Design a binder for this molecule. Structure first.
Ligand code: PM9
Ligand code: PM9
Ligand code: K
Ligand code: K
Ligand code: K
Ligand code: K
Lengths: 452, 455, 455, 452
């Protein structure tokens, strides 16, 4: 139900236990924005599960055996062999993180004017696709956009929508299908193996390429083992390996399910695309033999990816997130359902019914959570889409409580839960927010605000 | 009560997570003796809180700055300055752990034939005292021997017993008073500050030295802050500093409250004894500048001792143990009370009423606990008590216990639940636990290598 | 001259030490291409000084204090405060290495059709300039193209060429001047402070921006202190700070002079460009608070950049390279002169006079050097020059060289002797070195994966 | 001849480059004593090769995999297996360093009044023997006491002296033979395999036990491979294994040839003695399963001992010491000959001919070396023996330049050599020294002095 941590604590990280009065002053000095908070001031930093993971003793042992050679590093050979064994792809190009691989793939597989369709989008992924002249098309099923709808495998691609795109646009105008596992924006929702089969069957009949966003593929593999009939007696590794058998390649942000603080890579089976990838990695990331990573980090990511295949680790990872979601739902706090693999998303619509989507209820809710609890959370509603004078209104207005892997305990989840439950009582005190500075691209990171 | 961990996990330690049928295999290969289990086969190892603590990122940063010089290491000066500031003693000699310091103190402050009195005893501490020709006297309060009596500060010394010792035996025949904080043998019970001041006041009137067994002095200081009236406004470091102001020195096992995996030291104020300590440390430990420790470990112990002063850390340490004891007590599991600062003791005599002590209920209960949960605990009953080497019979202690010793900053409340739920489930059918018989029994220290089989 | 290492060895890196007959096996399996050799088969790897440096104990202590937070990491603030103090620039954006910063700068400061002029070029630097629609102009002094001309500060910009560029092409059509310190393509030649002041003086009169390629700016600063009169009383940090006072920003590869294995950053003073830099770093690198780097690596780079300011360290770094070049020159081995701050370049055209450039003497000499010593070097001749993709013929550079690139704080003078003695012995029978022919040749970047066999 | 370091530098240690004027002030603030110097003030610290070694990346990887369990640690199993494989002994008890094992052995194998004979002595070793009621008898050959005599294998035990002890005292009154490899006090001189054979043959015929001081046994093994006929085609490991086949047990200070900064152990083949050892290790060192060592240090010592078997490592180790000795001898500086495996010993008699052995020329020479060179050295002449009113005059009056393993370079040796050569020109400026404080035992460490 809620298993204990399948590991011991080897080393602890020093945190600051500042009281509520000083936390309020830290939030005021930050203009009531979580993205502008200082790490030294935050008790529980649930901003993102990206690169915030706690490594293992075996990974740190590999950190001591960094082969920092420019070419022919043993660390690269270990990572390349590991990814080939576990993902089954023919070739791998290391990158410094996921958006590095996305830059490479979007320049290699996109013709200007073609379409790229996927199960929702991500900020960096959609940018590099549109940067390279592609038009994004959301082919996730409509249910994935309903926060409260609790159905399994919400990340599945609607085959009818995919068939409609091929009929109206033609397979020649479709660069590739971008299948993300899991689907971050929908709440960390998984994709079923049956859906990955069906997408592969339909795309191959039209010669359409399929590239995965493998960023949280191990979490996705756990949901298959838990909820998809027929996979209950299959290991996580067997599920991961079969998942990528239905893809032509993948981009991976190791900073997620590879249990590292930096790292990523690009996979493909096509020899010619791999040749062009090595040409492009040099000018952006580095040599194909390190790709913008130190040897020690290629070693840590190779070891981390193998550690993620342990059933007990990934079961505890997901169920710890589920514990936080279950305790909030039991108290009546509105959340995105079902709980995803990496985060609990607070529904800012129902949390702030009095506020409209112009008043930015999610950002002021996240800013209110830290002031009252000392926990940082990420606004993942409207400001991620931005400001539009010619706003780019999304249906999901959420506040993301993102859990780094192997960093926090259930008692930490209780502090998060108990503090948010108390904020839910007087949810009317949450004010509105408006832009005062707007980046032309990816605005939620550097945007400043003021109360309405 | 029961606060969250006042820290994040920086790195983790890999464990095997073997199933029950496999754990039974391992326990049988271990001769049903948890001492013979392999670390790689254990999920939660509660054998001891000594040397098993998890260090901090700042401690591991110190591990990269080891000044490994044979003399004059910067790490020694950091350790020296820290102990001087926090404990207030004038001189410090490092040792590789606590019994190394006890070896030195017993040779320096004990004349053959003298007495050493203190609030009960520890095995290594008492050995070095008796090894140097001293007779041990237990001057602890009588309430300390009532394992079920739930009162505060059971480790306090009975001032009347000390006064009676000074009357019946000459004060010139008393080497020193060994005040231990906390008192391990009573279950980890603390000593009040008022008791330390009264012992210092009575001994100073007769010119009698007082040295502390301070291995768990930080745990002791938290009990003073929590339960002793008048210290609610004083920080842990202020309490620690005042504690040692009533002593002429101490022996310290850093492996306990200094949050390290190795290390100790010896403190004193007398300049002449410090000169003799430096001549003797070379014989057994090393130079006064490292004393049997790598430079990096003096640095880690210096950093860890300062981290122990954080109220939130030590409150969580003590209350995590208390959470385990409280959950067991609430389900009817018999435990030694009150819960100490570092371990929960199961009353195996009560737990296994259907077994006699000759059938080793504590050893069998520990074997059962591992099979059902993957938790290693330590037998602290008839097996550890040994045999009378003259008559051949068992040493039969009044306490037939299983010790759940909690390393610092290693486990979570979820791990405490694994220990509790498995023990509580075992207790709900405790009549099924079988007695053990000797299959192999060594000459000495039989707890470490003896092997058993079910009767 | 030739000072001892201003540091001790804290830890070592294991090497295989395979014999010659084994090394020949490895070289043949590598297709006689040192780029295809395995690191585990190499005793002394002089392929590059990028990312191959040995860190300090203090840097590794920082590696234990990584604040891995996605935004607001303490490691970023340490890096930011350090670069601001030592370089004097107003704003800093971290990147995972140097070409990441070059990607940002070229997109921020180049309008399609403009010119970018600088003292020669580097491959990645020039690519991002031309990728963003710029035309590169070489305004270096003519003496820089004379590989045997032994004069000081061969990297200085020809002020007349810059003045002529401002006259023939509009100043509004010049994106910026890319002043590199040092100049890699000339062999690692430094730029004088008087030249940087004259470039800043001339450009500021026309409102033209100046950005530095500062990857080896610390090596450059030592040459100023050693050879430029008037700086003999100024510290390295004072020289570094004055250098960047003549620039509006810089791109930095920490993998070079910041003594790290990964990392870089982008600096500028303009607030508006810094705002656009923060919007763009998210696209390719990461947040302005980590920019494609783990927290621990921002900490290591912050510590390493400050350590680079120590005069004794950088004097030994440059003079260790100079020792290799001096020993080779004293035996008659032909090298590019003067020796640069980071590498010694063998003149393979002169070394292998009996071979034509179509027989790849630099590639063959590097293959021979590894077989005889276990030293990997880099071909920097016709193979690395590539093919003309329109005509199919080789790119034929005037420099047919083998590069002995020295990582910082990794090797000793004894290792330099291994390189020198083996090369000197090869030179004493240089007529025995055989030419190479293509066995496998890829489409692009043939230096990395091509395979050869003896003719 | 002088091979390069068979390794690369992975990490460097920060040193202080204080000029001569400030070094002189640091020596004055220390009363012209090297033992009282601060590590932060010293450029090249040649005080001892004990625990000052630089570990490898593989050892530091093991430092990250410390199994800190009180019993059953994987690190103990690795160390126990490694010592059994490489030394061939049946049982091993870890100790925190060598004198910990010496305390154990002397209490287990010495009856009060018995004799312990060996090839010279060491400070801590002889103490524990005499502490337990044994009378030490030096059975090294006379040549070992002549500093300038350059003969091979000076550490060999004189079989005639050993035969004389058995004839005059009887084998029943001889506790054991203590065979040290190498012989520290003689200058690091090796012992030949033929001598270890002959000692074993003669002792076994009388039932006399033989226990080795294995502290610098790998250096000893190299000398056998280099200079003893028949062993030139035998590996270091084969030589080490055969060496201990002629012994009943050993005490080992891992802080020397095991390439660690802390650690040691006790070996024996006798089951009964091993049982008593486990009884005694508990009260002094700790459990037989860690013996006063953290798990990570048992791991590092196990890995270090295996690394010492590499011929290239140990060849460079000894020849680097030899390089320092050769450069000093070529300039006319008087030294102990031949150069030992771990240190170069400056003959203070010939370096200070004007001073007598009451004026303590070695201590003032060592104090003068640091003031002029910034290098710390250890007085290893008279003050190690002490002050006698009822001095304990030894024949060797030496200043030890002790080289830690894998820490320094040839350029460091040149700085040491060039500075001592200049001090040798005006060797008359070296004054005398007299005691002002005298420890009752092991005095040279805490003794203070003043000029005569
Ligand atoms: C503040 S948003 C940027 C980092 C963030 N995810 C990063 C993702 C990337 C880019 O990966 P990198 O951050 O470049 O390693 C690609 N796909 C997917 C599904 C992701 O969730 C996250 O916090 O969720
Ligand atoms: C300042 S003297 C003490 C440390 C020192 N040798 C230590 C030795 C020990 C004791 O070993 P520990 O120091 O206790 O690990 C035994 N035998 C032998 C032959 C040794 O050279 C040395 O510096 O040479
Ligand atoms: K330990
Ligand atoms: K040491
Ligand atoms: K690198
Ligand atoms: K990170």
């Amino acid at each position: 139900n809620y298993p204990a941590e399948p590991f011991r604590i080897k080393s602890v990280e020093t945190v600051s236990m500042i009281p509520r009065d000083e936390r309020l002053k830290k939030m005021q000095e930050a203009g009531y924005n979580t993205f502008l908070l200082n790490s030294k001031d935050i008790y529980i930093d649930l901003l993102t599960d990206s690169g915030t993971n706690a490594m293992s003793d075996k990974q740190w042992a590999g950190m001591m055996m960094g082969d920092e050679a420019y070419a022919g590093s043993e660390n690269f050979y270990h990572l390349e062999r590991t990814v080939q064994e576990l993902f089954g792809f023919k070739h791998i190009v290391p990158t410094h993180q996921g958006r590095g691989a996305e830059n490479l793939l979007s320049q290699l597989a996109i013709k200007p004017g073609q379409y790229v369709a996927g199960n929702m989008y991500f900020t960096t992924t959609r940018y590099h696709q549109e940067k390279n002249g592609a038009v994004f098309v959301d082919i996730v099923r409509d249910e994935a956009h309903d926060a409260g709808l609790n159905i399994a495998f919400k990340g599945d691609i609607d085959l009818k929508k995919l068939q409609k795109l091929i009929d109206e646009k033609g397979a020649e105008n479709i660069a590739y299908i971008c299948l993300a596992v899991t689907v971050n924006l929908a709440g960390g929702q998984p994709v079923s193996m049956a859906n990955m089969r069906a997408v592969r069957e339909l795309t191959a009949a039209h010669g359409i390429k399929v590239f995965y966003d493998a960023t949280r593929c191990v979490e996705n593999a756990y949901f298959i083992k838990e909820q998809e009939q027929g996979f209950e007696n299959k290991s996580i590794a067997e599920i991961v390996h079969e998942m990528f058998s239905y893809a032509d390649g993948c981009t991976m942000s190791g900073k997620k399910d590879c249990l590292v603080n930096i790292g990523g890579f690009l996979c493909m089976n096509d020899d010619e695309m791999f040749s062009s990838a090595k040409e492009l990695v040099v000018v952006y990331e580095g040599m194909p033999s390190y790709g913008g990573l130190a040897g020690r980090d290629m070693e840590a990511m190779a070891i981390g990816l193998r550690e993620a295949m342990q059933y007990e680790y990934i079961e505890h990872r997901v169920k710890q997130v589920r514990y936080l979601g279950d305790k909030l739902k039991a108290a009546g706090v509105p959340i995105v359902e079902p709980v995803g693999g990496h985060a609990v998303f607070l529904d800012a619509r129902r949390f702030c019914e009095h506020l409209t989507q112009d008043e930015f209820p999610a950002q002021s809710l996240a800013a209110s959570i830290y002031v009252e609890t000392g926990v940082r959370s990420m606004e993942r509603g409207i400001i991620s889409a931005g400001r539009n004078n010619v706003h780019h209104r999304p249906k999901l207005e959420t506040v993301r409580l993102t859990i780094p892997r192997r960093v926090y305990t259930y008692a930490h989840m209780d502090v998060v839960a108990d503090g948010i439950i108390k904020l839910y009582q007087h949810k009317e005190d949450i004010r509105g927010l408006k832009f005062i500075y707007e980046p032309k691209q990816l605005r939620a990171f550097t945007a400043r605000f003021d109360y309405i």
